[PDB]
Amino acid sequence: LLSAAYVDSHQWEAREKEEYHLADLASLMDKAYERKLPVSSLSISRFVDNIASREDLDSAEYYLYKFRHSPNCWYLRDWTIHSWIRQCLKYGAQDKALYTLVNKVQYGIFPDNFTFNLLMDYFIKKGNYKDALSVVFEIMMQEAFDVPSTQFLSLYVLYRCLAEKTELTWEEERDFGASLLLSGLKQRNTVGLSSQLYGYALLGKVELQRGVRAVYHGMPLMWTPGYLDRALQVMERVASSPEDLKLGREVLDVLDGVLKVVTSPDGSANLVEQLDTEEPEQSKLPRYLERFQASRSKLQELNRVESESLLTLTTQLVKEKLPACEAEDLATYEQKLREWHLERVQLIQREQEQREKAKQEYQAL
Amino acid sequence: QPPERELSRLRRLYQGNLLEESGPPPESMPEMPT
Amino acid sequence: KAYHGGHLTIRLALGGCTNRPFYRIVAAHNKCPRDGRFVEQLGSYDPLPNSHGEKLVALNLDRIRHWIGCGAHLSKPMEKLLGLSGFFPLHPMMITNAERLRRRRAREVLLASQKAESEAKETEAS
Amino acid sequence: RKKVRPRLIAELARRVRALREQRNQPRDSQLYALDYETLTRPHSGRRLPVRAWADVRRESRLLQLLARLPLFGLGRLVTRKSWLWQHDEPCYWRLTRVRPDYTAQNLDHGRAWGILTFKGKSEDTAREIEQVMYHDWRLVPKHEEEAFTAFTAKPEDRLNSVPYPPLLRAMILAERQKNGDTSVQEPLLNLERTRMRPWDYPAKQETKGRAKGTPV
Ligand SMILES: [Mg+2]
């Protein structure tokens, strides 16, 4: 979806970089770990910067792992993380980039929104919508749907995959539901409101079939039961809103199907987490089904339903708005490069000063 | 008398190891049976 | 002994003979033996009724206030004694236990009436 | 006297022993490791209490949540399942600093710092968080922070003054009459100066002890 300018690497490749032989730098880091001594962030930064071959990536991946499991793991620099993804794309090691991104806890690769778009867009152009979906799930787990550009790309991948996937497992429903909800909340357009109702519907299904703990456990989601109540509120909000907002017809069918399925179904971690006084969600389904029909009637009466499919609405939204986002993101990208360049120079200078002082200390000693 | 919401909060915390709920005690000491 | 750590406490030290208990209220370091070294004697408690049917407690309320003002803890039996006297509020478990005893005698009275009613059925059978 | 003589072996032993402790200090990944099959700590063999078994299998530790977040979740809000069940009002920590245990192969053990907000009332300074190794922590989602942290304080209804105990009240009134003070005012205790925190209020982690490094 993104333009060639967005994915161009002329600016990154033109960065000022110090020339250090990887073998020499490798020895320094190995000695530090043998002596249980901290390694500098500038050291790991120089290694990633001076990667010159596909084989070098494999060695750098090992050292990124070692840095994560070292005293100065927190100090991994943003430009070092961005350069890693840039180097992986350059030498054809996209699987490695996704591997470290998925295994973030082990390698410590937490990219920014611009870096996420670069990796996600590579897969989209190649047609690998299974790997692109993995990037979206990684963005969702980190709750990083801040930049508008990322939201448009994420919703395009989600809706395109959902159309192909007729059958969804409970884990898939949970991951898709969360991804749609978080990305949708940011967007106030028809596509944004449709994804919120779609996301709550899927999560509500998992809540009433496997319990509320399946939805929130290890997920960026709330633990209070009543996701189908949140879904119905989206319908009631759009219907009663003074402004004219529309919900795609495809989402409404999904919610009706979910309500029907749940309504007429056919070691010591077993706790009742809800108070006895509070009504269980299962008992509330009869009332939920009445609200749905009433809201659907009011929405259709007010002509607030969009017949067009969600995949077609999202495609139009991406085409209209993504071009503008590319210009804004690229402007911020240039500023970040200059900020990173200045911060890197400061670290190099501070390193030189302490080494000079180290000589004076030995002279005194 | 505890509030009903607080009695439910304790039934959840100690679920599986509970005793029968006790009501208000007798107003006076019951005369010893003889 | 040379104690290290601990606090001053007001507790009952057991005296007397076998089947004849008698208590001395004392202020003592908590690590000391029950009947051993103390700091001050703050009263006495005789738990056996006397000729008049009276259990006799003596409290040096001036020195007790002094040692509570200096951090002296109180043992649970001594907290119960101060509650009966009126110097402290009644202890939470003194009230709870009194409620349990009331609920336990209510059951006994009800059972006796049920037994009498069952005995009444026997009387009806003759 | 003068027949009391030095004890060099005792002096040597004390210093040598203290030195070894510093050299072979254990790490959080070792002291707080657990075998989930037996729910017993291998370092010491301590079996966890029974009331903690359900949560050890059903809940996560703090740095397990934070290891998955950028910057180890600095600025994020974290609450405890025990608080969620006990208190209706919001209870959470606002994370400010986080020192993971790098030795841990998953960065799942460490120390944390933050600003406490207990039962809707917020402290003014950051302090170290206690019970970081418990299976009780729940990360708050960013989109749910505003609804979670919303609290409106109710007017305090707990009495501010109470009567004196029956005997101590009579001794106060008796002293008044003896000293010539004539009044029918009722002696009243003031409870404002001495109000107790809840029993589950977070305690000071800085002043807490750490287990020794001798395995059982
Ligand atoms: Mg405790």
Curated annotation (Swiss-Prot), chain A:
- Gene Ontology molecular function: rRNA binding; tRNA binding
A GO cellular component annotated for this chain's UniProt record is: nucleolus
Summarizing the function annotation, the protein's role is: RNA-binding component of the mitochondrial small ribosomal subunit (mt-SSU) that plays a role in mitochondrial protein synthesis. Stimulates mitochondrial mRNA translation of subunit components of the mitochondrial electron transport chain. Binds to the mitochondrial 12S rRNA (12S mt-rRNA) and tRNA(Glu). Overexpressed in hepatocellular carcinoma tissues compared with adjacent non-tumoral liver tissues.
Location(s) in or outside the cell: Cytoplasm; Mitochondrion
What protein name is recorded for this chain? Small ribosomal subunit protein mS27
What keywords is this UniProt entry annotated with? Coiled coil, Cytoplasm, Mitochondrion, Repeat, Ribonucleoprotein, Ribosomal protein, RNA-binding, rRNA-binding, Transit peptide, Translation regulation, tRNA-binding
Q: Which organism is it from?
A: Mus musculus (Mouse)
Query: Where does each PPR repeat begin and end?
Result: 77-111, 112-147
Q: What is its main location?
A: cytoplasm
Coiled-coil region list: 326-365
* Gene Ontology biological-process annotations: cell population proliferation; mitochondrial translation; regulation of translation
Pfam family of this protein, just one? MRP-S27
> What's the family?
Belongs to the mitochondrion-specific ribosomal protein mS27 family.
From Swiss-Prot, chain B:
Enumerate composition-biased segments (Pro residues): 23-34
Give compartment(s).
Mitochondrion
Family, as annotated: Belongs to the bacterial ribosomal protein bS18 family. Mitochondrion-specific ribosomal protein mS40 subfamily.
Quaternary structure and partners: Component of the mitochondrial ribosome small subunit (28S) which comprises a 12S rRNA and about 30 distinct proteins.
Protein name as annotated: Small ribosomal subunit protein mS40
State the organism of origin: Mus musculus (Mouse)
Q: What is the lineage of its organism?
A: Eukaryota, Metazoa, Chordata, Craniata, Vertebrata
Question: What gene is this protein translated from?
Answer: Mrps18b
Covered residues, full protein:
205 to 238 of 254
UniProtKB/Swiss-Prot annotation, chain C:
Q: Which region of this protein is its transit peptide?
A: 1-25
- The question of whether Metal-binding is a record keyword is answered with no
Q: Where in the cell is it found?
A: Mitochondrion
Indicate the principal place this protein occupies in or around the cell. Answer: mitochondrion
Q: Which UniProt keywords apply?
A: Mitochondrion, Ribonucleoprotein, Ribosomal protein, Transit peptide
One term under GO cellular component: cytosol
Q: Which Gene3D superfamilies match?
A: 3.30.1320.10
Q: How does it assemble?
A: Component of the mitochondrial ribosome small subunit (28S) which comprises a 12S rRNA and about 30 distinct proteins.
Q: Which PANTHER family match?
A: 30S RIBOSOMAL PROTEIN S16, SMALL RIBOSOMAL SUBUNIT PROTEIN BS16M
Q: What is this protein called?
A: Small ribosomal subunit protein bS16m
Organism of provenance: Mus musculus (Mouse)
The uppermost taxa in this organism's lineage are: Eukaryota, Metazoa, Chordata, Craniata, Vertebrata
Swiss-Prot record, chain D:
Question: Where is this gene product found?
Answer: Mitochondrion
Tissue expression summary: Widely expressed (at protein liver).
Q: Name one GO biological process term.
A: mitochondrial translation
| GO CC annotations on file | mitochondrial inner membrane; mitochondrial small ribosomal subunit; mitochondrion
InterPro entries xrefs: Ribosomal_mS34 (IPR032053)
GO MF, one annotated term: structural constituent of ribosome
Source domain of life: Eukaryota
Keywords linked to the UniProt accession: Mitochondrion, Ribonucleoprotein, Ribosomal protein
Keyword Iron-sulfur tagged: no
Classification via PANTHER family: 28S RIBOSOMAL PROTEIN S34, MITOCHONDRIAL (PTHR28589), SMALL RIBOSOMAL SUBUNIT PROTEIN MS34 (PTHR28589:SF1)
What does it do? Required for mitochondrial translation, plays a role in maintaining the stability of the small ribosomal subunit and the 12S rRNA that are required for mitoribosome formation.
Q: How does it assemble?
A: Component of the mitochondrial ribosome small subunit (28S) which comprises a 12S rRNA and about 30 distinct proteins.
Q: What family does the entry list?
A: Belongs to the mitochondrion-specific ribosomal protein mS34 family.
What's the protein here called? Small ribosomal subunit protein mS34
The root-end lineage is: Eukaryota, Metazoa, Chordata, Craniata, Vertebrata
Give the gene name: Mrps34
